[PDB]
Design a protein around this ligand. Structure first.
Ligand code: FEC
Ligand code: FEC
Ligand code: FEC
Ligand SMILES: [Fe+2]
Ligand SMILES: [Fe+2]
Ligand SMILES: [Fe+2]
Ligand SMILES: [Fe+2]
Ligand SMILES: [Fe+2]
Ligand SMILES: [Fe+2]
Ligand SMILES: [Fe+2]
Ligand SMILES: [Fe+2]
Ligand SMILES: [Fe+2]
Ligand SMILES: [Fe+2]
Ligand SMILES: [Fe+2]
Lengths: 169, 169, 170, 169, 169, 82
């Protein structure tokens, strides 16, 4: 029925959302490390990708409300900390790839439940995850093939991501 | 194959267009009432949504022509007049929901018939119907929950939808 | 007659005219889709622009019907003719605009009889716009009749745009 | 099996790409004739559409690389030269119609191989092929129905396609 | 013999053109690989040179038409794929050099056939090939002498070649 | 071809109609009658060339497609000496 159709879509939406919450904390944790290491452009792009995941989490939450459900506040999995630079980019590529696989499954569920608006949302976000995927693979390729010679170039670059957060104060 | 496929898509396209024609007359009728009641903001937005349905009617017609068919000129269903404000918003949300449901099945037909262009057309319009649905649900909620304090706020507002219609004269 | 009766007779001619507009909107838009399909851009565009004039007429009639206390009709008068070839489109639209002006002038007399100055003036203004439509259609028809394909060859591939898109909700 | 889903998608991408290469050479061949016949506006649009097909070939190659494959440099079919003006537009409409049908099928494969990103690529390009189709059908209609009077209007028109190609030198 | 003169010039113009068509695909293949490796500046200049080769093909074609011939659509030789970065620049320098040698002979034939306009077209394009040769020798030289130090500088650079291709849609 | 051929037949008939006049003036009834008969034949050529021009004009290549590849024989070969 209509109610079961919505509940099944809400379920994959909250699963995706929980994955987004995990990515936000995982990438920001890496952001703090790269920043601490003073690899500015890497620090900045890692934070800009975290913000894309924040935006995904919010979009998933808004559709869940539209369907009458509650947006989860729990993250899926655990954040891995203290990763060395090569492990950061190899693991983040792995995560992006597994995310696209899972969201492609969630998309299918939306289509089966005849939910056109939610399947389109997954499709749009999956394209953005593909851009994250390509970025992490590329950095990993340079670390693998060029090592510290590549990092020497990143050392001390600007880490800014733009004007500060439009906020309340 | 091809001929059969085309005919099946033209049939759902005309069914949808017939629903668009119904919606144009139903929403404009309610628009005349709201204007007469002098709830400008509600009057204005109802007409703007009616113009979205006109553009949907026109996009369906154009696709129908591209497929070799003739666009229908009869609306589906009867127009309901004399609806009071609470009924206007409850019914329109009901209509938008039913529209998304039907278009979702029409979309499926396009996919089964291998017509990607028409499927994409439905997809886009369904997203615009979701916006209509949300708008009507929202007005309905404030009329249910707040009445007069909310209606007094709408009383006497501008009902202009912008600059006058580019026409022939 | 009395106040109510006076409004009622005027509401009745307003709904007859409005129903004629609804018909014009669908008939002209039907021809618009065909012209567009044939890729006669300038013709397709002016046909739609005239259909939009009729939408405005329908809306104006409606707003006056509500001001008089009545209910604007949603049924179109007559049926739409589909599949007309180009020469038939312009000959029939010219006939229809003529018939419209004929009927609206009778409707105006009724408004004057019922002592409704505002509604009478509405019909007057709209009759003037219908005259513009008639002259347009007669001129196209005349060139089609006299110049044939050589006239149409010049319209082929012209822009069909009616300007910026429909200020709508989404 | 991850690798087999990529192989199968890469295979249809290279088929579509080969079709793009054919179109590029076919449409530019016709552009050289149209210019030679001094029908500028027709020559110009023919070249602009060939550049669209160049972009498609590029987009397909980029996706083939993201999937780990090698973008083909072989075109499908044979270029037909020496076509008169009516025959250019009747064959090009036929070509575009055949491309949309083929691409719709390739899109099906992408969906079957669980590849949402490539499927969306195909759907985007199919929409552009539909624009090419309509264009060629309209020109061909004018030639069939109006011939010389129509061509008289095109004779001696401008043929520029805009600012010259940003190149290396 | 007028016609004989034209025929011999058209022959070398189609030989040159087939050489251009080969270069477009060879260079673009390498562009796709350099883009994949994320060496943006190299990928960008490779494509810009490919576009210069597209313009050469177009100019040969137009001269072929002025002479009453038909421009070839088949490339000369085979595209080599999978080249390592040093091999890309070593072979592109060899090809550019081979091209200037051939075009220089083709230019001689035009003069022998008393065709001043075609000879001047060759002289102009040869100067551009010299610009290409110099570019490939320079990059080849940095790779030989600087190794991964040079690559480290190119990793992550912009790959943009400007605004998108003015096209039909 | 057909446009100039129609103009040329029309001209001929004009010219021949004056040559006929000269024949009547010189009292040459036989030569007047020769011009009369031949002018009648030129009129058949004129009509033929006008018709082809009109079809080419109004139907173009659609018309020529029908003619493409038709027989061109004008019947049995020239009776000659060899
Ligand atoms: C008023 C009124 C009616 C009567 C309804 C009733 O039940 O009273 C009315 C009725 C119709 C009906 C049917 C159709 C569908 C015709 C068909 O597809 O056969 C129909 C179709 C269209 N109208 Fe329409 N309408 N309408 C306006 C007012 C009215 N309209 C205003 C105002 C604008 C504003 C124009 C603008 O600035 O974009 C406007 C524009 C459009 C466009 C153009 C959209 C575009 O190009 O983006 C199309 C198509
Ligand atoms: C991509 C791609 C391919 C496919 C090759 C592959 O192996 O992937 C590709 C292939 C070809 C081929 C053949 C030709 C030769 C056609 C012929 O003469 O038969 C060929 C020919 C042209 N390309 Fe081309 N292309 N292409 C671009 C990308 C690609 N191009 C981009 C980008 C632009 C940029 C548009 C701009 O901003 O000017 C662009 C423009 C042109 C111009 C325009 C020159 C001018 O007007 O100055 C000509 C001529
Ligand atoms: C009379 C006369 C002249 C003017 C000479 C003069 O100086 O008075 C005369 C002149 C010409 C001249 C030039 C040509 C060459 C045209 C050209 O090739 O440009 C020219 C060409 C031909 N006519 Fe000709 N002639 N002529 C006849 C009478 C005369 N003809 C009669 C009668 C027949 C009888 C047909 C038959 O039974 O074969 C006939 C046949 C031919 C055929 C047909 C051959 C075939 O189809 O087998 C061709 C071609
Ligand atoms: Fe995400
Ligand atoms: Fe991501
Ligand atoms: Fe709609
Ligand atoms: Fe709607
Ligand atoms: Fe009207
Ligand atoms: Fe009118
Ligand atoms: Fe394409
Ligand atoms: Fe195309
Ligand atoms: Fe070159
Ligand atoms: Fe070169
Ligand atoms: Fe004759």
């Amino acid at each position: 029925n209509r109610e079961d159709r919505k509940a099944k879509v809400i379920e994959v939406l909250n699963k995706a959302r929980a994955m987004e919450l995990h990515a936000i904390h995982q990438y920001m944790n890496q952001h703090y490390s790269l920043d601490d290491m003073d690899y500015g452009e890497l620090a900045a792009n890692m934070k800009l990708i975290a913000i894309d995941e924040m935006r995904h989490a919010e979009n998933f939450a808004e559709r869940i409300k539209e369907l009458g459900g509650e947006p989860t506040t729990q993250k899926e999995g655990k954040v891995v900390t203290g990763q060395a630079v090569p492990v950061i980019y190899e693991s983040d590529a792995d995560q992006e790839d597994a995310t696209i696989e899972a969201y492609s499954q969630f998309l299918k569920v939306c289509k089966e439940q005849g939910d056109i608006v939610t399947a389109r949302l997954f499709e749009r976000i999956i394209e953005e995850e593909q851009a994250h995927l390509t970025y992490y693979e590329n950095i990993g390729s340079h670390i693998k093939n060029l090592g510290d010679t590549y990092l020497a170039k990143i050392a001390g670059t600007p880490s800014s991501t733009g004007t500060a957060s439009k906020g309340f104060v």
